[PDB]
Each structure stands twice: as C-alpha cells, then as structure tokens.
Design a protein around this motif. Structure first.
Motif, PDB file in Angstrom:
ATOM      1  N   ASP A   1       4.964   8.113   0.674  1.00 11.76           N
ATOM      2  CA  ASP A   1       3.779   8.362   1.354  1.00 11.76           C
ATOM      3  C   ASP A   1       3.633   7.488   2.716  1.00 11.76           C
ATOM      4  O   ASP A   1       3.124   7.801   3.871  1.00 11.76           O
ATOM      5  CB  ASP A   1       2.638   8.823   0.990  1.00 11.76           C
ATOM      6  CG  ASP A   1       2.655  10.034   0.243  1.00 11.76           C
ATOM      7  OD1 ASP A   1       3.493  10.877   0.366  1.00 11.76           O
ATOM      8  OD2 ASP A   1       1.442  10.073  -0.658  1.00 11.76           O
ATOM      9  N   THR A   2       4.184   6.310   2.305  1.00 12.20           N
ATOM     10  CA  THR A   2       4.057   5.190   3.419  1.00 12.20           C
ATOM     11  C   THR A   2       5.412   4.548   3.772  1.00 12.20           C
ATOM     12  O   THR A   2       6.545   5.133   3.155  1.00 12.20           O
ATOM     13  CB  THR A   2       3.333   3.873   3.005  1.00 12.20           C
ATOM     14  OG1 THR A   2       3.677   3.326   1.990  1.00 12.20           O
ATOM     15  CG2 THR A   2       1.836   4.376   2.656  1.00 12.20           C
TER      16      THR A   2
ATOM     17  N   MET B   1      -6.738   7.358  -1.015  1.00 16.57           N
ATOM     18  CA  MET B   1      -7.319   8.424  -1.419  1.00 16.57           C
ATOM     19  C   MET B   1      -8.896   8.482  -1.345  1.00 16.57           C
ATOM     20  O   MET B   1      -9.488   7.488  -1.347  1.00 16.57           O
ATOM     21  CB  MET B   1      -7.488   8.413  -3.146  1.00 16.57           C
ATOM     22  CG  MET B   1      -5.952   8.356  -3.501  1.00 16.57           C
ATOM     23  SD  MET B   1      -5.890   8.275  -5.609  1.00 16.57           S
ATOM     24  CE  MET B   1      -6.222   9.991  -5.799  1.00 16.57           C
TER      25      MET B   1
ATOM     26  N   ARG C   1      -7.560   2.581  -2.230  1.00 19.94           N
ATOM     27  CA  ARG C   1      -6.289   1.994  -1.773  1.00 19.94           C
ATOM     28  C   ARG C   1      -5.569   1.580  -2.988  1.00 19.94           C
ATOM     29  O   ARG C   1      -5.741   0.816  -3.673  1.00 19.94           O
ATOM     30  CB  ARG C   1      -6.388   0.988  -0.627  1.00 19.94           C
ATOM     31  CG  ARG C   1      -6.703   1.778   0.790  1.00 19.94           C
ATOM     32  CD  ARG C   1      -7.095   0.591   1.467  1.00 19.94           C
ATOM     33  NE  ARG C   1      -7.260   1.095   2.993  1.00 19.94           N
ATOM     34  CZ  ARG C   1      -8.610   1.575   3.554  1.00 19.94           C
ATOM     35  NH1 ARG C   1      -9.614   1.651   2.555  1.00 19.94           N
ATOM     36  NH2 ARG C   1      -8.533   2.060   4.707  1.00 19.94           N
TER      37      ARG C   1
ATOM     38  N   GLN D   1      -0.653  -2.321   5.747  1.00 19.28           N
ATOM     39  CA  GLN D   1       0.243  -1.957   4.714  1.00 19.28           C
ATOM     40  C   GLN D   1       0.408  -3.363   3.779  1.00 19.28           C
ATOM     41  O   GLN D   1       0.866  -3.184   2.551  1.00 19.28           O
ATOM     42  CB  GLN D   1       1.314  -0.976   4.718  1.00 19.28           C
ATOM     43  CG  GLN D   1       1.055   0.259   5.204  1.00 19.28           C
ATOM     44  CD  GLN D   1       2.252   0.956   5.354  1.00 19.28           C
ATOM     45  OE1 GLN D   1       3.594   0.619   4.960  1.00 19.28           O
ATOM     46  NE2 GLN D   1       2.554   2.156   6.319  1.00 19.28           N
TER      47      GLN D   1
ATOM     48  N   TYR E   1       6.419   6.514  -3.904  1.00 21.45           N
ATOM     49  CA  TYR E   1       6.459   5.353  -2.723  1.00 21.45           C
ATOM     50  C   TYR E   1       6.708   5.715  -1.510  1.00 21.45           C
ATOM     51  O   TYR E   1       6.924   4.824  -0.452  1.00 21.45           O
ATOM     52  CB  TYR E   1       7.277   4.250  -3.375  1.00 21.45           C
ATOM     53  CG  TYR E   1       8.901   4.906  -3.366  1.00 21.45           C
ATOM     54  CD1 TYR E   1       9.676   4.876  -2.407  1.00 21.45           C
ATOM     55  CD2 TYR E   1       9.421   5.006  -4.676  1.00 21.45           C
ATOM     56  CE1 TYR E   1      10.991   5.250  -2.388  1.00 21.45           C
ATOM     57  CE2 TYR E   1      10.647   5.340  -4.663  1.00 21.45           C
ATOM     58  CZ  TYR E   1      11.602   5.508  -3.693  1.00 21.45           C
ATOM     59  OH  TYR E   1      12.867   6.064  -3.835  1.00 21.45           O
TER      60      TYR E   1
ATOM     61  N   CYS F   1       0.783  -1.303   0.131  1.00 21.31           N
ATOM     62  CA  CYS F   1      -0.131  -0.031  -0.049  1.00 21.31           C
ATOM     63  C   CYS F   1       0.702   1.345   0.000  1.00 21.31           C
ATOM     64  O   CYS F   1       1.554   1.477   0.820  1.00 21.31           O
ATOM     65  CB  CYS F   1      -0.910   0.061   1.153  1.00 21.31           C
ATOM     66  SG  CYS F   1      -2.067   1.223   1.273  1.00 21.31           S
ATOM     67  N   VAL F   2       0.595   2.329  -0.967  1.00 21.98           N
ATOM     68  CA  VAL F   2       1.367   3.299  -1.111  1.00 21.98           C
ATOM     69  C   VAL F   2       0.519   4.631  -0.760  1.00 21.98           C
ATOM     70  O   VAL F   2       1.057   5.750  -0.581  1.00 21.98           O
ATOM     71  CB  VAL F   2       2.039   3.656  -2.547  1.00 21.98           C
ATOM     72  CG1 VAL F   2       3.062   2.358  -2.690  1.00 21.98           C
ATOM     73  CG2 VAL F   2       1.064   3.304  -3.798  1.00 21.98           C
ATOM     74  N   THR F   3      -0.796   4.491  -0.754  1.00 20.41           N
ATOM     75  CA  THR F   3      -1.561   5.596  -0.739  1.00 20.41           C
ATOM     76  C   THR F   3      -3.186   5.277  -0.241  1.00 20.41           C
ATOM     77  O   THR F   3      -3.617   4.147  -0.994  1.00 20.41           O
ATOM     78  CB  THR F   3      -1.589   6.711  -1.604  1.00 20.41           C
ATOM     79  OG1 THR F   3      -2.017   7.915  -1.099  1.00 20.41           O
ATOM     80  CG2 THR F   3      -2.496   6.491  -2.843  1.00 20.41           C
TER      81      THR F   3
ATOM     82  N   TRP G   1      -3.680  12.663  -6.268  1.00 18.63           N
ATOM     83  CA  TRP G   1      -2.279  12.079  -5.466  1.00 18.63           C
ATOM     84  C   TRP G   1      -1.319  12.244  -6.461  1.00 18.63           C
ATOM     85  O   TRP G   1      -1.190  11.645  -7.482  1.00 18.63           O
ATOM     86  CB  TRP G   1      -2.740  10.795  -5.247  1.00 18.63           C
ATOM     87  CG  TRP G   1      -1.373  10.265  -4.719  1.00 18.63           C
ATOM     88  CD1 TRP G   1      -0.871  10.650  -3.479  1.00 18.63           C
ATOM     89  CD2 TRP G   1      -0.963   8.860  -5.007  1.00 18.63           C
ATOM     90  NE1 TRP G   1       0.292   9.779  -3.249  1.00 18.63           N
ATOM     91  CE2 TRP G   1       0.175   8.842  -4.019  1.00 18.63           C
ATOM     92  CE3 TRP G   1      -1.037   8.262  -6.210  1.00 18.63           C
ATOM     93  CZ2 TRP G   1       1.040   7.822  -4.217  1.00 18.63           C
ATOM     94  CZ3 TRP G   1      -0.118   7.038  -6.192  1.00 18.63           C
ATOM     95  CH2 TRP G   1       0.877   6.759  -5.239  1.00 18.63           C
TER      96      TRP G   1
END
Ligand code: SPH
Ligand code: SPH
Ligand code: MYR
Ligand code: MYR
Lengths: 60, 268, 8, 283, 268, 283, 60, 8, 8
Positions: free
Chosen positions: D95-96, D71, D239, F157, D93, D67-69, D89
């Motif tokens: 943001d997490t 929204m 996601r 994640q 890579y 998972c990178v974001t 967005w």
C-alpha cells in the motif's frame, strides 16, 4: 542466561562489552543481533562453469 | 590446454542428444548451483515420485525465430515453453506437482562481417506487465503462456483500450525488461551475451528455483528466458539483414508428484 | 553462572 | 568466518609491469565480471584499510520501521444511515512504496516481523465538548475467522484471535510475529496463477488474477475504539510501522524504475520515461 | 602456454598508465640492456639527484601522424620529443643535467585486407644531414629540435640555396637514413618491423646511452626514433588509402642533477 | 598513567639561596613558557596537595546538554494560501553562541553526539476549544534524501531515514549518534574553498563561499505534528539540546572575543571594542 | 558483563564502588566514563627543539 | 561470572 | 562475583 558481546568501538572517550538477556520464549521476540556474516560475490559476479584466472585471457 | 582443449569448444550430451559448439564463451551455472533432485530433508509430498530420466531429460529444439534490424526482443517461460515436448510434457500434465532444472542453449551464428549483440537473461519469477491502464494483474492464462512460440518485447507501451472486451495480454516494453525495471540492470540475473564477433551460442544451466520444494508446473512458471538485442544486427551494407536464432532446452533432474488423470488445459 | 553467561 | 563488520582488504603496493599477463583485457560475453583491483592497472602504494561493510548488510539495510498503512477510525453515535466507524485493513507491504521497493530488490525473503503502532486523535468539530481518554482494540483476524461487521459485534470477544488493547497517550504499541508463510520463503514475485483453466470446464470458472497466489494471504487487522461514543466527535488514526527482523533474502533483482501501479509489476502510461536528458560528451 | 599466455598479447604498466596490445611481435630491449639508475661507481655530479619516479615515468602519447601512399618517413629525437610532456619536461628544464631511458610504443593498426610494412629504428646519436651544399654542420637548434611533432624524410636531396638567409635545416633523404649510410643496413640498430599482416605495434625498451654518465638534456639528444615505410601502404584498390600511426613514449629510471632556475629555450 | 582526577603536585619546602642558577631570568623570544614554581623564587613550606583537575578535563568541560535550536511547528487546517506548519532545520552548532564558543577553543574535534528534545505546546487563540494529546515526528533527512514539502507527503514514511515519534507530556526524547564525519575529525575552521576557480572556465562557475566545505554537511531535521488538525489551534516548539560525548580535541585557539556575525569568523562594525577603560596604575 | 569501578569519595557519611552495564551494541550509545587521562603541557608550553633547563640561561 | 565482571 | 559482592 546473559549473553556478553563486544562493541566495535567508533570514537573513543581494553575491549568494551554489552550485555543481552532474552525475556521471551519465542525467538521471534528477540531483537536483531547484527552479528552478521559476509559472503563472497562469486555466485553472481563469476557464475561460470570454468574458474576464471584474471591475468589470463578470458577467452582461449 | 597444450593437448588442444578450449573454452570455446564444447560438447554437451543429455539422453539421446548431443550438442557441439566451436564458438562458445564458456558456460554459466545460475547462482553457481547445478540442478539436483529433491532431498529427503527438504521433501514435502509423501508419495513415490516419478523420475522420467533420459525420456524427458534430453534436448528439445523449439521453433527457430528470426533476428532483424527491427527486432525488439523475445521471451519464453519455463516450464511452459516445453509443455508439448515429448515425454516431458506428458509427465508434466499427468501430475499435480513437478520440478525441473534446465540446460538452455541459445544458437545464433553469422559471419566475420556481421555485427550485433544479443543479451540472454534467465530471470527467476519473470512477472511481466499487462496491456491495461484501467485494471491490473489481468493478463489471461492463455495470453501469459504462449508455449513454445514465446512472446516478444515492444519498444512502446501501447495500452489496450477496448474496455468492453479487453485484449488481456502482456505489453512488455524492452527498456524496462517488460516489468518496470531498467534493462541495463538485468545483468544481476544469470546471463550470457552473444556478441557476433566473439561467440555463436549462449549456454545457461538453470537450477530449480522457487520458494517451495516442488510446485504446480501448470499454474506456475519458475524461470523466464529473455533475449534482447543489446546491439542491433548489422551486415556489410544491406539495409535488411536477417539471421536465425534457435533455442534448444533440456529439462534436468526433473521429478513429479501427485499422479492422476491428464490435465487438459484450455490454452486458447 | 560460568556456563549461564555465554560470551562472544 | 568473515563478518559484516570486518575491515575490507588492504591495498598492496605494486610497481611497473611489462608482461604477458593481461588483467585489463576480458570478455563479458562469458557472463562474468572482471575481478580487477587498482594494482592491476596502475601503480599502487600500500594502504591499511579500515572501512567496513557493516551498514550495508541485509539486516542493517532493513533495520528500520517503515510505514505500511494509515487506518482511520472514529467514535461517533451509530445512527440509522451512518454507523460508528471501525477499520479493516488487509495486511500487505504494497500500500506504500518505500519499503516495497527495498524488499523488491529481491525475489524471495524470510523474516520475523515487528509491528509498531502509532495512534493519534483529534476533534472534528468546532464544538467545545470533551472526550475522556480512548482505548483502542487492534484485532488480528486470520483468513477464515469471522470478520467484524459492527464496532461492537461478537467477534471482538477475541477468544482465539490475538488482540492489542492500546491506551491513548501511552508509548506506541508493539508486537512481534514469526515467519508465518505457508512456503519456505515469502515470494515478492509469483509468475503464475492460482487456477488452471480447464478446457472441459467453462472459461469463467477456470479464471484468476495474474501473479496472485492465495486470495487472502495473511488476513486482516481490524481496529476499533472500545469506548462508547461521546457527544463530541473524535477521529483517530493508526499508523502501522513494519520492520523485518532476522531477515534472509534470495535472488537479486533490478530495482523498480518507474512508478508502482497496483500490487503487480504493471506500469501505467505516461510514467515510463524516468531518465533525463544529458549529452554523450557533456561532463 | 597451455593456460593461455602469448607473445602477441601484452600489457605494459608504468605509473597511472596501462597499454594493452593483442597483436605484438614480442618486445625489444636495446643491446639487451634494461634502463637503470646511475650507479655510485659511475656517478659524476656530487649533488643529491632528483628522481621524479611515477610523476615523470609514465606513458606520454604524442600527436598522431598519418601514413599514406606518399609518406617517405618520420623521425623524432629523445629527450626532445618529450620536452613539453608534463612533469618530465619540467624536471628537464629546471636541471642542468639529466638522464633517461624510454619505453617506446609505436601503434598502427589496419585490417586483414591492408598491407604494408614500417621499419621502426632506435638510433643512438642520430645525427642528421643538413640542407646546405655551401656550408656544413649548420642546421639551427630550432630546426634540429622539432619537439613532439618530429620531422620527416624526403626521397630527394634538395639543397637550400637562399645563401643570404639560409633555411638552416635538415634534409634527410630516406634511402640514406638521412645520414649518408644505406637504409638497408639500419637493422644493425635496435628495431622492430610493423608488418600489417603480422602485428599492429612496435615496442622498444631503450637504455640510457652516451659516452658520459649524465649530460645536458637540453643541448643533447641521446636517441633518434626513425620510422620508415619498408613496404608501402596498400589497401583493397583505393588509390588513396590512409592509416594513423600513434607514438606513445615513457621515460624510464630518469634522474636529474644541478638544480637552478628554469631554462627557457628559444625554440622559434 | 596520570588521570584527570589525580591530586596535583605537592609543594616542597625550600630555603635561602645564593647561587648561579637563575630560574627567574628567561627569554620568551624562544617561544617557551618558563616552567617556574613558587619554591623557585620564594621560600616555601611543605604542602600536601589535594586539589585535582578532574572538572576541567575535555570531557568534563563539555558534559552538558546545550541548546542549539528552537523549532516551531503547529497543527492548523491547511488552507489554499497557508498550510499546516511543519519545520525544517539544517543541523549545526552555530545558530546559538554558547556551545559554539566552547567548541571553538579548538581547531578540530571528534565525538559521539547525544541529542535531547524538549517539546512544549500552547493555545494560540482566545478560543475555548480543545485538543487531544499530540504525537510529534522528528525525521532525520540526510543529504540526498527527499526533503518533505508537506506535513503529510510520502517522505514521512521514513522507510530508511531514522525517525523519532514523540508523545507529548512524556519524558524528553533522546538519541545518540556516532562520529559521522567524512574526515578523521570535524573541522571547526576550514581555511579554504570547495571550488577551484579555473581561468579557462568562466568566473561565475569557479566561485564559492570562503571557509565553507560541503554545502550540506549533515542534512536536516524535519519535524511535524502527526495528528490531524483540531478546530482549535495549537503551536508547539521543539528545543534541541546537544551534548558531545567521548570527545577529543586538537590545536587550541584563542576564544571568540567579539560577537559572532554569521557562520564564519566575520565581525561586524561597532562590535569590535570589547575591553573597557582601566588605568595603568589603578588597582 | 558488568563493570565495577570506584568513586573518588568527596564528603564521607573502605573504597566505594559503582556498577555499569552497557545495554546497547553501538559504542555511541554508551554514557561517558569520565575515567580520563591527563597529559603534560610541553608540546604547547615548551615546543622548542633544544630541551630547556629552568635553572640555566634560556639563551646561551 | 568471574571474567564477566571486569573491575577498575 | 565473589569479590564483586562485598558483605557487611
Ligand atoms: C495483534 C497484531 C497481530 C498482527 C499479525 C500479523 C500476521 C501476518 C503477517 C503478515 C505477513 C506478510 C509478509 C508479507 C508479504 C508476503 O511477503 C508477499 N505477499 C509474498 O509471499
Ligand atoms: C532522529 C534524529 C537523528 C539525528 C541525526 C544527526 C546526525 C548528524 C550529526 C551532525 C554532526 C554535526 C557535527 C558538527 C559540525 C561540524 O563539527 C563542523 N561543521 C565541522 O566539520
Ligand atoms: C542467565 O540469564 C542467568 C543470569 C540471570 C541474570 C538476571 C536476569 C535479570 C532479570 C531477568 C528476568 C527475565 C524476565 C523474563
Ligand atoms: C554481564 O553483564 C553478566 C552479568 C549480567 C547481570 C544482569 C544484567 C541486568 C540486565 C541486563 C539486560 C541487558 C539489557 C540490554
């Protein structure tokens, strides 16, 4: 255009195979084959100009 | 060698400069790749390159620094540390693009009665951490490029707080290699150790490394040289011992593209 | 078919 | 020719020694690591080795959607002060933290990218009204293209930008992307600036962020609910899962040891003491 | 050796134990005979022998003793010094008969500014003299077998006189090798000298020696290890210098016959 | 070469006997079972046998998905004393009894595992509100990885842990797992401890459970509802079905005759009289 | 890479076959073939050091 | 194809 | 393939 490869069999119930076909023109669409190569760590573990013999003195 | 030759004794010659050493611990070639010129298959700018050869690919000695019981460490960036070095610096500022490899020779002698160990690390893309906790990626170009004099590590992160007019500089804590990773693991980077009982120099041959075949040398540093005291200086019984460290560096197989008027950077 | 089917 | 799944070397039997060969003694100052194996310092028996490094290959290490974001969009009635919510967005890579840490074991990388989208929705009010099934539009806006200002403006026509029209309740959406870098590899780290401060020219002009290359690397994702709004309000989340396929990596780095603080290597005060107490002579 | 190798630098490995030394004066093989197992032509007990191999044929380190300006010397007996050493001692006490060879490694380092010389002697059947002048051959088993801690030489024969309840112990005068012969001639026995300016260790490989193919290890010691200061310890100017001596010994090609219940010796 | 589905041996015709061969007399003290067939003690006719043992092979005996657990999750608003409910389950075959009994006919086993997930939901209150279709996340957390503390914390994640994102109302989810044991076979029974109590060291330290090997064998499954909560409350259950495929078994055991009482062989008072009254001379 | 095998036909309406193709690289993903072998019970029914002849006295 | 199709 | 394809 089918591609046949063998599975490295883990727990058993001749070689077993699986089959792959690419449906898309772009190679980016392809799944990962996982048929990867290993290399030796030398360039990181022994980056020295003079080759080392482990039984001899590192420093002479 | 029965006829004399040894690992500890080397002679390096580049251009009109020769280095001798009688107490080396071999040489390191980073990632096992010797410096080379840009190949046609990998070439990108179409113009005839400038290749300074002996005029620029020689040994430049930077300012000698001094190691003491309180030293936490020193750092330099390449090509930045060589920006004012003779015909190398000139070719660098006259061209938009440039690439270079380097022979790095760190010099530090002492005596059979001293002790201490310096870790010498060549780090690709050595991005260091800033002094601010209210804003990120904000160290200024002037602060990021010390030139030949380099910068130093600190043992303590101490955040710039003058928010009105910020320091805008790096704050590299030694045990975190100034970048948020533990120093104990910096050995995955090309390195040598100068352990005073064993050797008095470190020699590293660094290839050009980047994600591009050639780039802006003025905008971008390819390599960081980090020197940290793995084991502190100590001598006989003197509470304040001191010994010098001298850095000599030679550009190798360097070539430049995109000639124009000279770049006059604001460095203060 | 012979050719396609490549095999590994 | 050695493949990631070949078995590792066999242990060979070795007996007593009394000689001048000194495997155990070395000098790490050289920068090398002593390539010793057990039969060098102890008496070994013979063992036919079956274990392999198959799962720790670079592909196998990264062969996971991460998972990178997240929204957030919704489908409410656009009204004079507040508008129907579409999302924007900037692709990254960073943001997490989990995949970011894995990629940053390396300085540079090359890979094709697989993006998978999981879409979930719910009712925001203690209403009773309903909503018919929603269709979402995920538009890729590359750097330079008109960014949308309204859930329904002309940009969503996507004549040239790639868009995905996702129907709620169907299998999560998925597309692949080639290696799209303007370099020969992606740079996880960039020790430089995108601007040379020129003496002759004023300072304010010469300036730029440390370690940042193009202000807008890869553009943005813009997501909207295509349906006109219901009286009832529904909020949805998208996601995004990223997987590097066909990956190559160069120049290894020590892993991030202290909490990430921004898109760079910066670290924040009070997060710098990772290791814990443990005495020298305590097992 | 042009590729590095030398007399002074050795690595010995037996079982799960490895010894390194960078300052040896070669190795000695007593009477030029390497330890070996009992041959069929020379065999005597008819039962299948126990051969412990790696479990017993490894390096056991005994208690470190300390060398000073007043030290007159130390002694040990084999197998006695190893009687409590792991699985070797156990195999020893469970069987009536046993035989073993040994690698003896004596360790004593100091500094380029110290001086002194230790004579290390391996003596076959090292019968030592008792403390009595009114009766002979009367040292007790307990007194004769110190185990790992060994015994010491004295510079003076001082006769036990409590006739009512005698000491019943050895009284080994150093210049007479504790046995009535002059120390200067002990060099006819397998030996090495640890001379502090030259080397820091002594290594002796001892074969099984006896007038029998195999014997009672509990009743009989095959070898004596005698260490005497040929030249006294001296350092810089300190009137009381001290340096450690460590003994590490490995049973070699050892085999046992006549299995039964364990022997529980009265050792006090 | 004999396969599980080959026909069994034919009965051969046999006539009267008057001899010294004594098939019927034996001595079980030896530990053997008398390999007699009907033609040994009675006059038989010839019969061409068609029956086979195809369905009682080890694979065929276990070729069924069996329920090993029910997990409960929900999707309500996390509030100061009570939180949105996610579920955590330690993977095992011993929470239910039927498959456990079947596996325990044997001491050791080896197999690939097929896990199938059936997901059902319902409304918990006499409300009237609604809920849009739910997506569930089933994350595998292997021993060592960060266990989730909140339905929405960073662990979900899944950068490296395997996760399944299941959409409600679609076909039940299914994955396969290899033989993952750190031994050469799984041990249905372990007659020992994971700790040696050492005299020299205090008793409290030396201690450990009888018959238990690694405290955390195979890690856990963590399930959550990805959707943000609706005003209306929906509870969901996840039933897990396990099927051993490509199975091998060793060292047969008598089957469990009395009720299971815990993860071990322990039996509880009052459950120990399984057999029922039936007189010696009553058909 | 297709694998063809025969079904042991139960109630009938030549040999009949079915076809299998493996889609995945990991052998753990494979279905169960059910093409299993039988063994003889000896190791459990007759684990005795001396081979037994059923017509002769078990004990002699 | 000949090889791929294995048959049993 | 020849064999697999049986035909009727
Ligand atoms: C309809 C969906 C289309 C989605 C299209 C996505 C295209 C853009 C791909 C993004 C590439 C990002 C790669 C990651 C970052 C770079 O590695 C670092 N900043 C270093 O260069
Ligand atoms: C996304 C779903 C992933 C699910 C991954 C499950 C991996 C773990 C498999 C569990 C293995 C359990 C085998 C059963 C128990 C052992 O036989 C006994 N305790 C004996 O060793
Ligand atoms: C090589 O591929 C020749 C054999 C083709 C076998 C049948 C392929 C199955 C259907 C593939 C259609 C491709 C979809 C883009
Ligand atoms: C051996 O397999 C060669 C013949 C291939 C026949 C067509 C296969 C049908 C589609 C298989 C695609 C595989 C999906 C991973």
């Amino acid at each position: 255009g089918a591609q046949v490869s063998s599975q490295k069999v883990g727990a058993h119930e001749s070689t077993i195979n699986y089959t792959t076909i690419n449906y898309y023109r772009d190679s980016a669409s392809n799944a990962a084959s996982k048929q990867d190569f290993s290399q030796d760590p030398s360039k990181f573990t022994e980056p020295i100009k003079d080759v080392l013999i482990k039984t001899a003195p590192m420093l002479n | 060698e029965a006829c004399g030759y040894s690992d500890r004794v080397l002679q390096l010659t580049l251009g009109n400069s020769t280095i001798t050493t009688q107490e080396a611990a071999n040489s390191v070639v980073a990632y096992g790749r010797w410096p080379e010129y840009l190949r046609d298959s990998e070439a990108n700018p179409v113009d005839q390159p400038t290749e300074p050869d002996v005029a620029a690919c020689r040994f430049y000695t930077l300012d000698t620094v001094s190691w003491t019981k309180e030293s936490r460490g020193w750092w330099w960036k390449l090509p930045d540390a060589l920006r004012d070095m003779g015909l190398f610096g000139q070719n660098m500022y006259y061209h938009y693009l440039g690439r270079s490899g380097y022979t790095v020779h760190v010099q530090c002698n002492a005596s059979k009665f001293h002790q201490g160990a310096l870790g010498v690390f060549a780090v690709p893309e050595m991005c260091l951490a800033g002094d601010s906790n209210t804003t990120t990626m904000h160290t200024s170009y002037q602060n990021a490029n010390p030139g030949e004099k380099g910068g130093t590590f600190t043992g303590t992160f101490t955040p710039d707080n003058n928010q009105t007019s910020p320091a805008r500089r790096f704050c590299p804590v030694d045990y975190l290699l100034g970048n948020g990773t533990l120093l104990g693991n910096a050995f995955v980077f090309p390195h040598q150790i100068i352990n005073l009982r064993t050797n008095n120099c470190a020699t590293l041959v660094l290839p050009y490394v980047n994600s591009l075949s050639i780039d802006s040398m003025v905008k971008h540093n390819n390599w960081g040289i980090a020197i940290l005291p793995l084991a502190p200086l100590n001598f006989a019984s003197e509470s304040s011992p001191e010994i010098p460290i001298t850095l000599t560096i030679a550009p190798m197989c360097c070539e430049f593209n995109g000639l124009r008027n000279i770049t006059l950077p604001r460095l203060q | 078919a012979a050719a396609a089917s490549s095999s590994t | 020719a050695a493949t990631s799944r070949d078995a590792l070397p066999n242990t060979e039997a070795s007996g007593p020694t009394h000689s001048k060969e000194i495997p155990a003694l070395t000098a790490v100052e050289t920068g090398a690591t002593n390539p010793l194996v057990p039969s060098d310092t102890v008496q070994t028996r013979h063992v036919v080795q079956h274990r392999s490094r198959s799962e720790s290959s670079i592909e196998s290490f990264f062969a996971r959607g991460a998972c990178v974001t997240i929204m957030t969009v919704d489908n409410s009635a656009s009204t004079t002060n507040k508008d129907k919510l579409f999302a924007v967005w900037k692709i990254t890579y960073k943001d997490t933290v989990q995949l970011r840490r894995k990629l940053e074991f390396f300085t540079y990388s090359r890979f094709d990218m697989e993006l998978t989208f999981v879409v979930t929705a719910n009712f925001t009010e203690t209403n009773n009204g309903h909503a018919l099934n929603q269709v979402y539009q995920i538009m890729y806006v590359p750097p330079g293209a008109p960014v949308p200002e309204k859930w329904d403006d002309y940009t969503w026509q996507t004549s040239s930008n790639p868009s995905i029209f996702y129907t709620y309740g169907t299998a999560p959406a998925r597309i692949s992307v080639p290696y799209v870098g303007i370099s020969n590899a992606y740079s996880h780290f960039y020790d430089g600036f995108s601007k040379v401060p020129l003496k002759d020219q004023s300072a304010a002009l010469g300036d730029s962020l440390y370690g940042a290359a193009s202000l807008n690397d890869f553009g943005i994702l813009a997501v909207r609910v295509v349906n006109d709004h219901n009286p009832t309000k529904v909020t949805s989340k998208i996601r995004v899962y990223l997987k590097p396929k066909h990956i190559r990596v160069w120049c290894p780095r020590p892993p991030r040891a202290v909490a990430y603080y921004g898109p760079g290597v910066d670290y924040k005060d009070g997060t710098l003491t990772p290791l814990s107490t443990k005495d020298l002579t305590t097992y």
